[PDB]
Ligand binder design. Structure first.
Ligand SMILES: O=C(O)[C@H](O)[C@@H](O)[C@H](O)[C@H](O)COP(=O)(O)O
Lengths: 470, 471
């Protein structure tokens, strides 16, 4: 009559190891399983001293958990997650809860949820953010699925999640795939933030001639202000590190080929699906692809001419402040877009997303965490129906004040040949969004000209077609 | 006796399939038509009086009416209706028969159907058709992919009905499986970019120089006589001559700035994300349509968000006009470079051996992006077939070196005046990123290793490294 463990974890790459370890440290007993035995062996070596046990079949695994079973899945997304669910189905019992903590496409979560639902099994797709250090110490947990199912797993999520000022970085997101959706958008925003930081860095490096020491001082100083954040903090730290053999800074030793997981494009791809403008995050993804084409770039550099550029001799302090402001405004524009995407998705899929609550859980644990997120919550506190963050009085006052600096950074980059794709797309967004009559009147005329696609009029209701060819 | 075996059949009698039908018949081919909804066949037959077109009224009758090997053109609604139709054909077809899908189809569905049908010994050609309704009647661009042996059988028909430029039909065998529908998609993507770029030129002239309909028209007419010569510039010049009868305003000034798009518009951008290719200009153009569709939000925001408080323009007018023109051309170059590098990436991924010069060649006529521009692309690949990027070609390299200063001036002026130029701005950014040997992705890679141990490579050593950033 075996003695029953509180939670099961299948999948033992580092993310699942570190989360099982987190869970145990909060006083829960854990059983674990891995298709490959050697990973379970290695985890049990590392895990000695902890209330964690190993199992070597799915029969054993399911049979070692107390009912209603709580199974956390942390296997590779796609077929391997699906193959593990198929393995589980014969042995699960009505009422058991499978939690997919993988980086899963939300529409897979939608399907699994329905498929398991008809069998009487609850499915929670949850995003987990923070990297390895987060998983171990305090991730952001972004769960969606059946509300009643969530309530059973909520105390564990709240136990292991990061806390900001006494408040858990987790909340019920919405039904079916809403959690994995928010996790996707979080990963989009992250790509965005890193690109805009890179631009700020590249500008300082090439306009001001800044070396690693001075760059660190600028970013360290920025992190004590409104830009206070994990990414800017780690950025300022990265510029202090010295490679161990050349004597140069390590960051200058690193090859400028930005990797990215295959999940990095999803936010942009779903934005296209929904009809929401996501220029900054999308440019950031394309910026990574362009950087990956290193060989093409080094070859290109030798034949394609840039502009003639006498050395910069504006005010050094003013320019640093212009970059800082450009970055904050551009970041605001990016989140304004990202939060608009989540709204659109909530409408499409009937999720009733609570945007202040979402901003609240991005506040700690996750990679994009930043003080800034407090003002986003404040925004949705004031108007839960807010259609765009730029309209909230705090962000509106910031963009009207910092727009001159973004304008200057974009104009200056253009003339000096510094690529600032995200900053420039942020400025084009701001000017498009605030403009009541854009040049799409021409585009529509064209489309009716060659395609008979019909148009609408400013002065009367109706659908109109012109015989353009005289 | 004997139902008079026809050379080709067409299923689907919307204006496109009807016009393709009539095009084919006018070239001396006999055509059998069918349509699930009966009244469309009836109507078409009274439209086609005296022409060698016969109606048939069941898939069975339709199939029995055709010469072997059978050649069947599908012009029906994308998705389920197309698969429904193929599924009804299957029992009646034979080893060697040829089903051609001519819709604006997603290339992966073609790939699936191609192999599904190859299993039964039936060939499948997924082919793009561009030019609109008038173009399908008079001479479209045709972009077939599928089995070569099957393409050789229908090639003569495609070549007869296609547009010709300088004696060359705007049609070629693009490659295997979904190759043809892929190229059509990229055609579509490129179109979106071009329209956005010309919209931006218009807005710049409109707002910076306060130009009205009439002078915009003179400027776009002047531009059509030079290197920008193209169907889209041409129709743009004509559009600005139109007057609304009721209001007496330029028609264009009375049209709601809310750009529609087919669900197909986004595909090129989504695919670029799949392949890992930078496609910023066309993607910004799709997002610009989405933005324009949010008209109500925009007018709301316009009452609330302030732009810069900038003085009216006092620079040289002729200079600014030529700067816009040049920025527009260089931007266009950058979009095409991006779109052609996508096709190259695709060709490599799906093993298609695409001929980029032949593709530019079939975009010279029939299609919407048709311009003398396309000749210079053709020439670049005829020079270097494995050219990795069109920017590296002698002709295009000379333009961008001479025009980049217009683009920069335009981007800098747009920024300072608060006039949005998403396409042209991203063109510049791409150009400046492409030609730059060391990008700030070294920081990005440091960041990723710092928080998720994703590892990095280095400039000096030839290995794979991970630092413990907390020591
Ligand atoms: O913590 C999270 O939210 C993710 O699980 C984590 O993995 C990271 O955010 C990116 O997904 C890394 O992806 P790249 O290495 O491709 O940047």
């Amino acid at each position: 009559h075996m003695a029953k463990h509180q939670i099961g974890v299948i999948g033992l790459a580092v993310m699942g190891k570190n989360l099982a370890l987190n869970i145990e440290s909060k006083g829960y007993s854990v059983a674990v399983y891995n298709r490959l035995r050697e990973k379970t062996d290695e985890f049990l070596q590392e895990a000695k001293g902890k209330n964690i046990v190993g199992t070597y079949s799915i029969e054993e695994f399911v049979n070692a958990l107390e009912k209603p079973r709580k199974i956390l899945l942390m296997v590779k997304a796609g077929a391997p997650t699906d193959a593990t669910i198929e393995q589980l189905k014969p042995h699960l019992e009505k009422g058991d809860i499978v939690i997919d903590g993988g980086n899963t496409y939300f529409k897979d979560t939608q399907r699994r949820n329905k498929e398991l639902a008809e069998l009487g099994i609850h499915f929670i797709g949850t995003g987990v953010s923070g990297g390895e250090e987060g998983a171990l110490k305090g991730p952001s947990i972004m769960p969606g699925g059946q509300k009643e199912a969530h309530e059973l797993v909520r105390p564990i999520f709240e136990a292991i999640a990061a806390k900001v000022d006494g408040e858990p970085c987790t909340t019920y997101i919405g039904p079916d795939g809403a959690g994995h959706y928010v996790k996707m958008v979080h990963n989009g925003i992250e790509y965005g933030d890193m690109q805009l930081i890179a631009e700020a860095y590249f500008l300082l490096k090439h306009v001001l001639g800044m070396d690693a020491a001075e760059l660190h001082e600028v970013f360290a100083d920025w992190n004590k202000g409104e830009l206070n954040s994990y990414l800017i903090e780690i950025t300022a730290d990265i510029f202090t590190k010295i490679d161990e053999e050349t004597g140069k800074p390590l960051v200058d030793v690193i090859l400028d080929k930005a990797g990215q997981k295959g999940t990095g494009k999803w936010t942009s791809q779903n934005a296209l699906d929904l009809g929401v403008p996501l220029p900054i995050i999308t440019e950031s993804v394309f910026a990574r692809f362009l950087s990956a084409m290193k060989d093409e770039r080094v070859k290109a550099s030798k034949v394609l001419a840039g502009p003639a550029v006498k050395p910069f001799e504006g005010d050094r302090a003013h320019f640093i402040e212009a970059v800082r402001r450009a970055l904050y405004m551009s970041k605001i524009c990016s989140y304004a877009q990202g939060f608009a995407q989540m709204k659109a998705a909530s409408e499409e899929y009937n999720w009733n997303l609570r945007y202040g609550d979402i901003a609240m859980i991005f506040r700690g644990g996750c990679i994009i965490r930043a003080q800034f997120l407090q003002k986003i919550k404040e925004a949705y506190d004031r108007d839960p129906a807010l259609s765009n963050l730029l309209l909230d009085s705090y962000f509106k006052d910031i963009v009207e004040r910092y727009q001159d600096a973004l304008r200057e950074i974009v104009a200056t980059a253009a003339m000096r040949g510094i690529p600032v794709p995200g900053s420039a797309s942020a400025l084009a967004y701001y000017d498009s969004y605030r403009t009541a009559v854009l040049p799409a009147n021409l585009i529509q005329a064209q489309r009716d000209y060659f395609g008979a696609h019909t148009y609408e009029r400013v002065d009367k209701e109706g659908i109109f077609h012109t015989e353009w060819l005289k």
